Amino acid sequence: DLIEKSKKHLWLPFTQMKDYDENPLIIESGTGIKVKDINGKEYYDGFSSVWLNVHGHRKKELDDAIKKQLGKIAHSTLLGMTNVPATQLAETLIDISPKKLTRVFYSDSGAEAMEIALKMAFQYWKNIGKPEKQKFIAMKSYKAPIPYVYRSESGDPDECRDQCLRELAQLLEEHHEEIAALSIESMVQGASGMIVMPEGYLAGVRELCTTYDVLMIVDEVATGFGRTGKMFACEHENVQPDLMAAGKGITGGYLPIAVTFATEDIYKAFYDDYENLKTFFHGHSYTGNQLGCAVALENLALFESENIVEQVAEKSKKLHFLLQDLHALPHVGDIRQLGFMCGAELVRSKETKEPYPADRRIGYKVSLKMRELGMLTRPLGDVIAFLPPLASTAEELSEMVAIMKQAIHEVTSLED
Template sequence: MIKTFKRHIERLDRQYLWHPFTQMKDWTEESPVIITGGRGSFLKDITGKWYIDGVSSLWVTVHGHCRKEIDDAIKEQVDKISHSTLLGLTHPPAAILAEKLVKIVGANGRLPLRLSKVFYSDNGSTAVEVALKMAFQYWRQKGVKGKETFLSLDNAYHGDTLGAVSVGGIDVFHQIFSPLLFKAYRAPSPYCYRCKLGKKYPSCRLRCLQEMEKVMWKHHREIAALIIEPLVQGAGGMITAPEGYLKGARKLCSKYNILMIADEVATGFGRTGKMFACEHEGVSPDILCLAKGITGGYLPLAATLATDEIYGAFLGEFKELKTFFHGHTYTGNQLACAAALAGLGIFKKEKTLKNMQRKIGLLGNELDKIRKFTHVGDVRQRGFMVGIELVKDKKTKEPYPLEDKMGWKVCHRAGEKGVLIRPLGNVIVLMPPLSISAGELKSLARITARAVQEVAG
């Protein structure tokens, strides 16, 4: 019975589905893992096999799967209403969540933030589109001419819509679309393991920031905002910025009258060990993008937070057309907001951030063992964001060629052993739910280590 159903789903998948970021030729030659259930840190496939969800279902699951509190909040909301628009109407979950987000962002001196207004959308890319358009229109309405482009980093990833791709810096994903994109300036990525400037931290004294300053000095009249993934460039390969880099970037933005957009779509909601990555360096962006973990990994929701200063520039008489003409159909969906409120409740109730500190240390100890492997060039960790960079030659740092599909092979092997993870090229990513137990975390690291050893040697 199960076998027949499995074959049926496989056939439907092969015949009708087109998967994201997937070479479908390869996909149709493999037997896919079909997920039918989940509990805590685990996912269950159609045959009843359980796996550790090592990447939190693409970096979103925060408190584990099937959390009663979130399940109940959604069910309760379903019985009232599932969706009504925020265009011309409002509703309790959106308003209550907006207050919570503003407070949580500024709580306990967390960020010296002036972020006071919440603009909802439904995914990370739209949160970024909103931020870019907001920054652009802000300068127009302030009467500052010429600030019509952006500054972003090499290896940056801000989503897949064209605005987000325009400020992206991963050539494999983005190069092909270049004729469709607007112009943006780039600064070097703080990728210490492969420093393009040939420097070493800390003796470099953050030379990459000096390069950023050069671009700002030359083009600040054209640059509306710097968009940056604070502390960790996620999709670029879990590239962790050295201490002081983020704070330095903030200082440069202020010096050159450039807004700072912090894209915390991946780093937000505890991923780096604090609620928001900006907190680590006491940095206050002008615009903050949130998504992914905002609903605990249940439903699509995003929020772009702006300062009073930015919001104020959009106020005016109706006929002045200073309105922010942007919005998505499911903006601030009621179910998603209810899930987000329940997720925030769990942070408080379970002291998630406090409890994860010990686990961050434990994960670090496990990673130290992997660091020694012959084909592991670099291991980067910031909280529960981990990148294990595989190399063909540890001495020369020569990467494995694309066609070796090394990252993919390691993840495939880990899957056979009961751990679901996904690579970013030659980088193996670990991003477990924050609620993972110490024992599960050890298993995740050890099984990954074994998969690396078996595949790469």
């Protein structure tokens, strides 16, 4: 009856509370890559608690890092001063980030880190006397398209790539003098349905931004910290962001810490005598929280000593083969994967690739079937996301993929 109480006082993020009331779920504990509910039923953490859990739950080293920091101080401010763990973590993050990035600006969430990146971009140009550069390009302000090869007319990766790059170039051509920055997810569009960008695409946008003197903001909130088989996904194409947002996996999934990385050139445009009004007057009260910073330092220590990134890249090879036989199912239209970042797009006809009408709630229905079959994930429309913890074993991966295959079949054959 914590259950009937839950229905009374909560308002959950991104969720229709009527859906919640009809199918409540309350998690009590976790161990390894499984979480347990208040009835004792276990589930594989098939989405890494929304793309942030790295080493599974109750990871000893992580538990210990927080316990240790408690023994010193939980929180002191970064407003006008600093603390030991935030400073140490800043140096460590800079060691592993793309080389052009030299500064760490903390915040609480990935959304905050992105918002800061945009404000930085905007004020940067104003600070250096170019107040005309105030517009933004959001790749899906002006908007420019990212390749969606699966639903393209050519079905051709680099045709699609080149055509999208041509359209961005046109946008850049006639408005660059007015544009402060372009924002883009690194390599994989998450919320859009785990859409992996064709080779050379991200590199191409970097090139255009440099050419037309526009700051490139790269969102690594989902992709960062090993998720795609590289520490940061922009390593796949050797891209150097001007500003880079990270969060989620940074703390191994334990606590809210997020970061906006900037280059030295951006930082110095705000560095001056106070009187000169160059200061970046933004931030948050919990910025650089010791508890969160302490757990992130140990998270990173583990990446190094557990060779997590190599292990992810290795395991991703067999994972691909498991997924392709998933492709065989009558309603699996497309399989998309980069590292442990995967999605299975569901469709009513794989020949015409016509989707189900949204009102058949296929994605939701699959997620519920997987739930009863003992696995958590979150659907994106009718794309079944699969983002297993980075510590997942080959065995655990094959078990999670099997549950996906069964749920998809059991649901979609009724067409639900």
